[PDB]
Amino acid sequence: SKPLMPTSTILRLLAELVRSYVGIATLIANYSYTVGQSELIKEDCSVLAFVLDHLLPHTQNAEDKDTPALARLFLASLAAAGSGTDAQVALVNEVKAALGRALAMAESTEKHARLQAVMCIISTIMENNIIRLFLKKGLVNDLARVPHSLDLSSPNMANTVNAALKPLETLSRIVNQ
Amino acid sequence: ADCRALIDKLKDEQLLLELQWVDLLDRFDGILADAGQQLKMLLLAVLNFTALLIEYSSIEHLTTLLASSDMQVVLAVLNLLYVFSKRSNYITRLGSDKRTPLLTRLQHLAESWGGKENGFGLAECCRDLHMMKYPPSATTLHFEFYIHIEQLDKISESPSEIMESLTKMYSIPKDKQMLLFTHIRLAHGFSNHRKRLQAVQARLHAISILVYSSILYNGLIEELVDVLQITDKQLMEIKAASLRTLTSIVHKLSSIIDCTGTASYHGFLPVLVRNCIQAMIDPSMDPYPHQFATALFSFLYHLASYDAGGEALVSCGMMEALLKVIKFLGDEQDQITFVTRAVRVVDLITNLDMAAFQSHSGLSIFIYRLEHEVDLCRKECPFVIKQCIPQRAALLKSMLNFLKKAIQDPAFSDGIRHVMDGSLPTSLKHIISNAEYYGPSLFLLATEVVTVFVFQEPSLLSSLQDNGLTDVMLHALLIKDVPATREVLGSLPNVFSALCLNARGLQSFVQCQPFERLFKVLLSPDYLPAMRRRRSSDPLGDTASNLGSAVDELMRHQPTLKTDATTAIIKLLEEICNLGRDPKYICQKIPIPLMDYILNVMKFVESILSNNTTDDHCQEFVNQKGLLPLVTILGLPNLPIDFPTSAACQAVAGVCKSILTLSHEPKVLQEGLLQLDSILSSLEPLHRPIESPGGSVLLRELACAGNVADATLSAQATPLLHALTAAHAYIMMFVHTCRVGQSEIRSISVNQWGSQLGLSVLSKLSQLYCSLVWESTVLLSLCTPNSLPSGCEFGQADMQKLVAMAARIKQIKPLLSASSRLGRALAELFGLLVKLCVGPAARSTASALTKLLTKGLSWQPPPYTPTPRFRLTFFICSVGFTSPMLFDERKYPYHLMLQKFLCSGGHNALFETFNWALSMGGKVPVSEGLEHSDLPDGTGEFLDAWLMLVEKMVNPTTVLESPHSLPAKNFPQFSALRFLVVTQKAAFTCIKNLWNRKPLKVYGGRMAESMLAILCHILRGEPVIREREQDELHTFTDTMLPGCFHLLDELPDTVYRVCDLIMTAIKRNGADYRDMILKQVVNQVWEAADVLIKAALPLTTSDTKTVSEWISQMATLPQASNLATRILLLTLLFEELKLPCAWVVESSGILNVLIKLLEVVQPCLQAAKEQKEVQTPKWITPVLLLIDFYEKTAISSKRRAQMTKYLQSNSNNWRWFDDRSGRWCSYSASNNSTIDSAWKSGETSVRFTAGRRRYTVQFTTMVQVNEETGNRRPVMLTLLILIQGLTEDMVTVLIRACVSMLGVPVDPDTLHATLRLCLRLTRDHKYAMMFAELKSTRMILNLTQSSGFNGFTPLVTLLLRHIIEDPCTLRHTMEKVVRSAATSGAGSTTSGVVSGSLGSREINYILRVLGPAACRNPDIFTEVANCCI
């Protein structure tokens, strides 16, 4: 009775169609959901926004176990696929928007799971045009502002700050080396 | 013991615990589960004693007991958890149900207070300080998650109810109010000294537990050393806690050393130690408390155990103070324990310095203390050859370990001569002389100190003999009873290796009959606990094996002993024979543990004889007649029925095999055969039947055994059952000695079995085999519940003596198992004997074994049998037995055995058993038998076994090609060809007699499949054997199809064997026969399909239900059972006959009919999905697979045709690719012609030889593999019936049907077939668009795991890619692939070097790599490769 194509499989499939076919990544970047299109949708939002917010973050209760690894694969593929700037720019813009959104989120394990998972996606993407975009958009400065948008007493705070330091270290190195 | 007395005394309780396991620990765990929910002092006493019990279920209560207002219990709980974590990892291994709640309560106790830097140093927490020199935040609560309280005094009452009041006044985070309770009880404590000291002590315990299992910081060591310096002397328990914490912290060590000051003689820790020691020594100076002194010497031990600490204890000269202790300390139990602690430290220190110890005469001090303690035992136990207090025994033990270590250490090699001119031997003499007052491990240490000394200075063995220490050891190890333990037994031979070392010692050792005494251990129940396997994971008899290997090492050092050792071994065997022969003993699982004796002795003898592999012990043993007592052990009357399967019988067999394989001596087999012949001659009454209506002889010998409760346990009560189980043990020994791969041992085995005695035994074993198959099948016929027999008193007369059903069954079951296990061992033996015989006397062994096969196949019961099933069950196991003996694993025969099986008989009897089984003794002809209603119940099971044997017997590809062929040369020469002539001729008639009759209830599809395999082998074989009656196989292949289709209606699973039969009949006959077959199959499909097309006309008038009937009618009509095999057959035929069957499937138009049927079933399936009761017509997958292979074949034929159009058919140059030079080098002309001819035949592979190297080409891969190296190299062919395929109007209907079958989730395997077809069709984007315009990706996403299969996600990914790859996107992706593959010197499974620049880059190879892209689309692939290459 469980679905035979879980969202995990659908993500791996889309990652493959991105990695092969140029136009698919741009079509995925521009595609956006509509209000009341599904139970999980509150307002018009991109597929990349949904993958960053609802599927990528670790959550303790399974729906599919390995949704986050494959949303990470999906976003990695959508980066690596050159696709000029159509896919990479919308990916980066949406990561910046989802970072600012999760930092403005109220202090919650939902906030720390979103934040940590976005740091993990910035780190996987970073492992060169993506770095050029991260600099132009000031993403490194939004990572550095992360603790301003934390409660520094939270039991999660050190893990989310570590996560935000991981791309800061790599990015500062790649620039200043 | 006194523990049990203390338990009974306790079961004023708290007064008894103040004076000082299961039910006392359970009463304690009781009050623990009670108190935590005249009480507290009971809990405290329970803890203070239990903290001794653990030191030689409560936990979940104890964790709650930390929630106490009176810290005494918190301290005591912590002290118990320290005793735990100190000794064993009991709280570390625990699960997180309570390990984390515990460790968190411990953390909240342990966590820092701010140390010196904030005015909370432990020194200041222990000195009073007036309560005004502490930080003002001490009497203050500041608990946050927000609570702050300036001072706790205006509410000093009831701190627990304060915490509960805070629970009511504020919502405190759940499950962490403990950090509040600990803060609140601290702030109550700090007001006063005792409560501050109790917090200090609880924190120190909690630290120590947390390290034996964030808390530690730079000031903690310095704080602890300042706690140790405080000289109010009322703090010794806090000082002991501080030392125990430092101990935990050892497990920063350089800082511990820098603070305590151990690197110098003057220093706080060394001075403290010396003052403790001096107070312990001199009576005037009061003694430092026992606990504190123990914490000091435990800290010294643990510090010494680490090199930095042992080097510090060198530097401060603690050896001088500790030798002072070991010289001047008294005799009382506490002082003894401090002495043993000092000894263990002087041991650790001497593991890295000797000079201090030697300069302080430490060896004289140790020896004097060993003299003093032995002299204090001497009062209790003055005996010396002409209980010890545990603490003194531990002292002696640690001190003897030190002396042994020193002897094995340089820095005594100069001077160790003067150990044994001290008092030491006079005190060892007392330990060795009193192994019952002193423990066995202490008696061991004493004999090992002598042994190690004699091995360091064998010269001074004369001094040890002069003072008689060796003569006391001999008496204590031989004449006095050896203490029965593993380590003592393991050492006796090493001891004797020392005491023999002087030759005078050897004389004295052999004078006192040492092995008669030493080996008695193996026959004594007192030492069986020493012999029992330890840990249950070391071998059986591991300790007797060690003992035997040590006696081997001993008498390989001392060859003069060999003869007496083997004499005492033979006396062991002769005594085991005595214990097995006479009636008065009975083997326990008077009872005697005989089977354990036999296992232990045999592991001992095995070790001795087989240890060095020099065959001196085997020869001595065999020449002293030990093989008779050995081989007799198998036949022992009072051994149990389950002996032969036991490890003791396998041990005796292993010793016989060791003697055989070492000495190469037949005498083991000769003696085994003599005794087996003696046992077989005893049980001839098993061969003689009742000669009246009667059952089993075993059951007439049992039942007539009076009324004995267990007759089978007595050798006179059941002589035949015990002769059975003796013969069984001998037979398991012959099995073990046949499982041998040395051709020489095989040869002498065969020479023995071929003897007059060998063949007398083998004849008697054959008659025994047939008797045991009879007896076992009769007995099972009697344990069956009045079902198998025909209402007759066949064996009832003896069951009436035996005896309401189980009372009779459970008396027979020992008979049934004793007879069935022996039969299986006989069968294993005969199989091994065939193997040895095959690979002159072998020819007589094989003769007697084929006479057994003839006897088994021609055996007829006595004429009192109530039913033929006893014969059919005899025949089935005779046949299943003759199979292993005529044929090897891998089904190749032994031609010696087939020769003798033919000439002697058993072939005529094999086929007569078939005639008998069908005709029922001539009552009915064979041609009517199979179909007769009254055919016996087991006639299908027999025929399954018979057919499985004959399938092996008929196969020419094994019977001619068998590795086990006879050589080429007075004797009649064998021909496997004439054997196959006569066998196929005899088998064919019997199959005739089964060809078309309806099948049996069970064993009818296995019968059919083996019958078809026999027909295949005959039809393939006559073409090959006429090379070196044809019209009968001709007319058969003509008329066989009515039977083939009868088999397809009854037993669908035979269809693969029917395909193979049809293919062999076709390759015998012409295309005029191929056409007839295929057109007849197609006519069956045609009518079966058109009736199903008429089965699904929409039901307008409602005469039938039109819902459940119609939906399941499509799936259940007989026509819908036929198609599922008529289509599947046609598909297998198609796969072999690729193009004829394609052209017939085209020209018949059947494909249109199957497409129309796939269309017309969709309304039915859809209505079924709406009934929610879908049941898929199984015929859908054959149809989809047939269509799949029709369009696979047409693709391919067009491609092969236009390939032929571009090749000259004469001398097509095949070329092999040289990656190293990058050349497509040609083959020789003979190789090219062979490869081309065999490629044109469509063979998958072709073999040829070049330079005597073997090359093979695989046209699946187009690769030449070198058969020697396995190197794979590419090959090419150098270029210079038209199957229309599915038309657009068919493909359109198929696409809609496949989408509808995805809509209704038809079945996993049917979805797999329909998606495979969609995958082939959609490779044209027009049809991929059709498949995507019918909303199939939604259905595919909606599919549930009930409708899934192994390949689903790969296949779906390929289908989606087929939809995504429109002409332009496919073009661009092909450009990407071509550029990538051409730019990167890609590796392959053709040994094309990775990133090569010749081989990896040739156009002719790269086009081979890009072949998948050319198949994906050849036009686009041309355009891209022309534009990008």
mmCIF file of N, CA, C and O in Angstrom, chain B residues 72-126:
data_model
loop_
_atom_site.group_PDB
_atom_site.id
_atom_site.type_symbol
_atom_site.label_atom_id
_atom_site.label_comp_id
_atom_site.label_asym_id
_atom_site.label_seq_id
_atom_site.Cartn_x
_atom_site.Cartn_y
_atom_site.Cartn_z
ATOM 1 N N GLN B 72 23.865 10.789 53.271
ATOM 2 C CA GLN B 72 24.503 9.510 53.574
ATOM 3 C C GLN B 72 24.143 8.434 52.555
ATOM 4 O O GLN B 72 25.014 7.683 52.096
ATOM 5 N N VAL B 73 22.884 8.392 52.125
ATOM 6 C CA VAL B 73 22.502 7.391 51.137
ATOM 7 C C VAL B 73 23.019 7.757 49.757
ATOM 8 O O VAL B 73 23.329 6.871 48.962
ATOM 9 N N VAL B 74 23.106 9.044 49.430
ATOM 10 C CA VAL B 74 23.660 9.425 48.134
ATOM 11 C C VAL B 74 25.117 8.996 48.042
ATOM 12 O O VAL B 74 25.549 8.385 47.058
ATOM 13 N N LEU B 75 25.894 9.315 49.075
ATOM 14 C CA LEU B 75 27.258 8.819 49.180
ATOM 15 C C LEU B 75 27.334 7.302 49.078
ATOM 16 O O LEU B 75 28.210 6.774 48.393
ATOM 17 N N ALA B 76 26.452 6.578 49.771
ATOM 18 C CA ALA B 76 26.557 5.121 49.749
ATOM 19 C C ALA B 76 26.174 4.535 48.392
ATOM 20 O O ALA B 76 26.803 3.578 47.920
ATOM 21 N N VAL B 77 25.189 5.132 47.722
ATOM 22 C CA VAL B 77 24.831 4.710 46.372
ATOM 23 C C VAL B 77 25.987 4.967 45.423
ATOM 24 O O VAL B 77 26.307 4.144 44.556
ATOM 25 N N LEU B 78 26.629 6.121 45.572
ATOM 26 C CA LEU B 78 27.762 6.455 44.728
ATOM 27 C C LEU B 78 28.922 5.511 44.993
ATOM 28 O O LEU B 78 29.623 5.109 44.064
ATOM 29 N N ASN B 79 29.197 5.232 46.265
ATOM 30 C CA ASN B 79 30.234 4.276 46.634
ATOM 31 C C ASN B 79 29.972 2.904 46.026
ATOM 32 O O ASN B 79 30.903 2.225 45.577
ATOM 33 N N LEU B 80 28.702 2.507 45.941
ATOM 34 C CA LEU B 80 28.376 1.248 45.282
ATOM 35 C C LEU B 80 28.602 1.320 43.780
ATOM 36 O O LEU B 80 29.105 0.367 43.171
ATOM 37 N N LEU B 81 28.251 2.445 43.163
ATOM 38 C CA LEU B 81 28.476 2.582 41.730
ATOM 39 C C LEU B 81 29.958 2.698 41.401
ATOM 40 O O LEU B 81 30.392 2.265 40.330
ATOM 41 N N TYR B 82 30.748 3.257 42.314
ATOM 42 C CA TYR B 82 32.195 3.213 42.173
ATOM 43 C C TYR B 82 32.730 1.796 42.306
ATOM 44 O O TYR B 82 33.598 1.393 41.533
ATOM 45 N N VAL B 83 32.249 1.024 43.281
ATOM 46 C CA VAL B 83 32.672 -0.373 43.382
ATOM 47 C C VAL B 83 32.350 -1.144 42.100
ATOM 48 O O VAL B 83 33.198 -1.875 41.563
ATOM 49 N N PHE B 84 31.178 -0.881 41.519
ATOM 50 C CA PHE B 84 30.828 -1.459 40.224
ATOM 51 C C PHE B 84 31.792 -1.033 39.125
ATOM 52 O O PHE B 84 32.425 -1.874 38.474
ATOM 53 N N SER B 85 31.897 0.271 38.880
ATOM 54 C CA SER B 85 32.643 0.725 37.716
ATOM 55 C C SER B 85 34.120 0.417 37.883
ATOM 56 O O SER B 85 34.830 0.192 36.896
ATOM 57 N N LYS B 86 34.594 0.420 39.126
ATOM 58 C CA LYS B 86 35.932 -0.039 39.452
ATOM 59 C C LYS B 86 36.136 -1.467 38.975
ATOM 60 O O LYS B 86 37.063 -1.752 38.208
ATOM 61 N N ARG B 87 35.268 -2.388 39.406
ATOM 62 C CA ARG B 87 35.553 -3.800 39.152
ATOM 63 C C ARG B 87 35.207 -4.179 37.712
ATOM 64 O O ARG B 87 36.093 -4.525 36.924
ATOM 65 N N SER B 88 33.924 -4.125 37.347
ATOM 66 C CA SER B 88 33.481 -4.585 36.035
ATOM 67 C C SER B 88 32.701 -3.497 35.313
ATOM 68 O O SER B 88 32.154 -2.579 35.928
ATOM 69 N N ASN B 89 32.653 -3.624 33.985
ATOM 70 C CA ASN B 89 31.908 -2.695 33.138
ATOM 71 C C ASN B 89 30.438 -3.130 33.110
ATOM 72 O O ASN B 89 29.892 -3.594 32.107
ATOM 73 N N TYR B 90 29.788 -2.940 34.256
ATOM 74 C CA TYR B 90 28.396 -3.324 34.448
ATOM 75 C C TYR B 90 27.442 -2.183 34.135
ATOM 76 O O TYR B 90 26.369 -2.404 33.563
ATOM 77 N N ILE B 91 27.831 -0.961 34.496
ATOM 78 C CA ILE B 91 27.023 0.221 34.227
ATOM 79 C C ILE B 91 27.412 0.873 32.911
ATOM 80 O O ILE B 91 26.684 1.752 32.425
ATOM 81 N N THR B 92 28.539 0.470 32.319
ATOM 82 C CA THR B 92 28.933 0.993 31.018
ATOM 83 C C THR B 92 28.174 0.290 29.900
ATOM 84 O O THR B 92 27.775 0.927 28.918
ATOM 85 N N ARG B 93 27.968 -1.024 30.034
ATOM 86 C CA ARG B 93 27.282 -1.809 29.016
ATOM 87 C C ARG B 93 25.774 -1.599 29.015
ATOM 88 O O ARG B 93 25.113 -1.956 28.034
ATOM 89 N N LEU B 94 25.222 -1.033 30.083
ATOM 90 C CA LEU B 94 23.776 -0.940 30.240
ATOM 91 C C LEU B 94 23.152 -0.122 29.112
ATOM 92 O O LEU B 94 23.808 0.704 28.473
ATOM 93 N N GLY B 95 21.866 -0.381 28.858
ATOM 94 C CA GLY B 95 21.129 0.393 27.886
ATOM 95 C C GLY B 95 20.696 1.747 28.429
ATOM 96 O O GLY B 95 20.653 1.988 29.635
ATOM 97 N N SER B 96 20.372 2.644 27.504
ATOM 98 C CA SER B 96 19.990 4.031 27.775
ATOM 99 C C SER B 96 18.596 4.181 28.365
ATOM 100 O O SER B 96 18.143 5.327 28.478
ATOM 101 N N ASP B 97 17.870 3.129 28.748
ATOM 102 C CA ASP B 97 16.661 3.338 29.537
ATOM 103 C C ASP B 97 16.974 4.033 30.857
ATOM 104 O O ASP B 97 16.241 4.936 31.278
ATOM 105 N N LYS B 98 18.057 3.632 31.526
ATOM 106 C CA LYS B 98 18.463 4.284 32.765
ATOM 107 C C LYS B 98 19.934 4.660 32.856
ATOM 108 O O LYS B 98 20.289 5.412 33.770
ATOM 109 N N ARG B 99 20.799 4.182 31.963
ATOM 110 C CA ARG B 99 22.182 4.640 32.013
ATOM 111 C C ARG B 99 22.281 6.152 31.882
ATOM 112 O O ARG B 99 23.029 6.792 32.625
ATOM 113 N N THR B 100 21.548 6.745 30.940
ATOM 114 C CA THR B 100 21.551 8.204 30.842
ATOM 115 C C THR B 100 20.883 8.913 32.022
ATOM 116 O O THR B 100 21.461 9.892 32.517
ATOM 117 N N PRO B 101 19.695 8.523 32.507
ATOM 118 C CA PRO B 101 19.196 9.163 33.744
ATOM 119 C C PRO B 101 20.149 9.080 34.926
ATOM 120 O O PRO B 101 20.359 10.075 35.643
ATOM 121 N N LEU B 102 20.841 7.951 35.058
ATOM 122 C CA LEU B 102 21.850 7.810 36.097
ATOM 123 C C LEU B 102 22.993 8.777 35.848
ATOM 124 O O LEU B 102 23.327 9.596 36.707
ATOM 125 N N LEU B 103 23.631 8.660 34.686
ATOM 126 C CA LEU B 103 24.833 9.424 34.411
ATOM 127 C C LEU B 103 24.549 10.918 34.439
ATOM 128 O O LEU B 103 25.437 11.707 34.758
ATOM 129 N N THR B 104 23.317 11.325 34.127
ATOM 130 C CA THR B 104 22.944 12.731 34.240
ATOM 131 C C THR B 104 22.776 13.165 35.695
ATOM 132 O O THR B 104 23.200 14.268 36.062
ATOM 133 N N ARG B 105 22.163 12.334 36.546
ATOM 134 C CA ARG B 105 22.162 12.670 37.971
ATOM 135 C C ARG B 105 23.585 12.749 38.518
ATOM 136 O O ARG B 105 23.922 13.653 39.300
ATOM 137 N N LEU B 106 24.445 11.834 38.074
ATOM 138 C CA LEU B 106 25.848 11.859 38.465
ATOM 139 C C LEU B 106 26.544 13.107 37.954
ATOM 140 O O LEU B 106 27.379 13.690 38.649
ATOM 141 N N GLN B 107 26.219 13.525 36.733
ATOM 142 C CA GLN B 107 26.803 14.738 36.182
ATOM 143 C C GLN B 107 26.381 15.955 36.983
ATOM 144 O O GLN B 107 27.184 16.863 37.217
ATOM 145 N N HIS B 108 25.119 15.999 37.402
ATOM 146 C CA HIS B 108 24.645 17.165 38.130
ATOM 147 C C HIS B 108 25.235 17.212 39.532
ATOM 148 O O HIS B 108 25.404 18.297 40.096
ATOM 149 N N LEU B 109 25.554 16.052 40.110
ATOM 150 C CA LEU B 109 26.352 16.044 41.337
ATOM 151 C C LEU B 109 27.788 16.493 41.080
ATOM 152 O O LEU B 109 28.338 17.315 41.820
ATOM 153 N N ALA B 110 28.410 15.942 40.040
ATOM 154 C CA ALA B 110 29.839 16.098 39.793
ATOM 155 C C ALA B 110 30.215 17.492 39.319
ATOM 156 O O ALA B 110 31.331 17.953 39.585
ATOM 157 N N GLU B 111 29.316 18.170 38.617
ATOM 158 C CA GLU B 111 29.686 19.363 37.871
ATOM 159 C C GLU B 111 30.272 20.448 38.764
ATOM 160 O O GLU B 111 29.924 20.587 39.938
ATOM 161 N N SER B 112 31.183 21.215 38.167
ATOM 162 C CA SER B 112 32.093 22.081 38.890
ATOM 163 C C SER B 112 31.339 23.144 39.677
ATOM 164 O O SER B 112 30.201 23.502 39.367
ATOM 165 N N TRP B 113 31.998 23.650 40.717
ATOM 166 C CA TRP B 113 31.464 24.722 41.537
ATOM 167 C C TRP B 113 32.155 26.056 41.295
ATOM 168 O O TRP B 113 31.749 27.063 41.881
ATOM 169 N N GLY B 114 33.183 26.091 40.449
ATOM 170 C CA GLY B 114 33.962 27.286 40.194
ATOM 171 C C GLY B 114 35.389 27.233 40.695
ATOM 172 O O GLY B 114 36.168 28.146 40.395
ATOM 173 N N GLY B 115 35.762 26.198 41.435
ATOM 174 C CA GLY B 115 37.135 26.016 41.851
ATOM 175 C C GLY B 115 37.730 27.155 42.669
ATOM 176 O O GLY B 115 37.039 28.001 43.241
ATOM 177 N N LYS B 116 39.066 27.136 42.724
ATOM 178 C CA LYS B 116 39.816 28.187 43.405
ATOM 179 C C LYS B 116 39.529 29.558 42.814
ATOM 180 O O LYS B 116 39.393 30.545 43.548
ATOM 181 N N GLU B 117 39.433 29.642 41.487
ATOM 182 C CA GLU B 117 39.364 30.941 40.831
ATOM 183 C C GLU B 117 38.110 31.716 41.209
ATOM 184 O O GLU B 117 38.092 32.945 41.080
ATOM 185 N N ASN B 118 37.067 31.032 41.679
ATOM 186 C CA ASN B 118 35.858 31.680 42.166
ATOM 187 C C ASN B 118 35.657 31.491 43.666
ATOM 188 O O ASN B 118 34.557 31.724 44.173
ATOM 189 N N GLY B 119 36.697 31.077 44.384
ATOM 190 C CA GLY B 119 36.592 30.853 45.812
ATOM 191 C C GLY B 119 35.867 29.600 46.245
ATOM 192 O O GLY B 119 35.394 29.541 47.383
ATOM 193 N N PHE B 120 35.756 28.595 45.379
ATOM 194 C CA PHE B 120 35.131 27.322 45.722
ATOM 195 C C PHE B 120 36.122 26.164 45.619
ATOM 196 O O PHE B 120 35.765 25.051 45.231
ATOM 197 N N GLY B 121 37.381 26.412 45.966
ATOM 198 C CA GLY B 121 38.348 25.330 46.014
ATOM 199 C C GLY B 121 38.003 24.300 47.072
ATOM 200 O O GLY B 121 37.444 24.612 48.124
ATOM 201 N N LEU B 122 38.343 23.044 46.770
ATOM 202 C CA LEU B 122 38.029 21.940 47.674
ATOM 203 C C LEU B 122 38.740 22.078 49.010
ATOM 204 O O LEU B 122 38.187 21.713 50.053
ATOM 205 N N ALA B 123 39.962 22.607 49.009
ATOM 206 C CA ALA B 123 40.616 22.892 50.278
ATOM 207 C C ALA B 123 39.759 23.829 51.114
ATOM 208 O O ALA B 123 39.579 23.615 52.319
ATOM 209 N N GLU B 124 39.224 24.875 50.486
ATOM 210 C CA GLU B 124 38.363 25.816 51.192
ATOM 211 C C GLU B 124 37.003 25.213 51.527
ATOM 212 O O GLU B 124 36.394 25.596 52.528
ATOM 213 N N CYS B 125 36.521 24.258 50.730
ATOM 214 C CA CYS B 125 35.298 23.548 51.082
ATOM 215 C C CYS B 125 35.472 22.573 52.236
ATOM 216 O O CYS B 125 34.467 22.071 52.750
ATOM 217 N N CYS B 126 36.701 22.280 52.649
ATOM 218 C CA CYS B 126 36.957 21.290 53.688
ATOM 219 C C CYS B 126 37.420 21.929 54.983
ATOM 220 O O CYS B 126 37.064 21.460 56.064
#
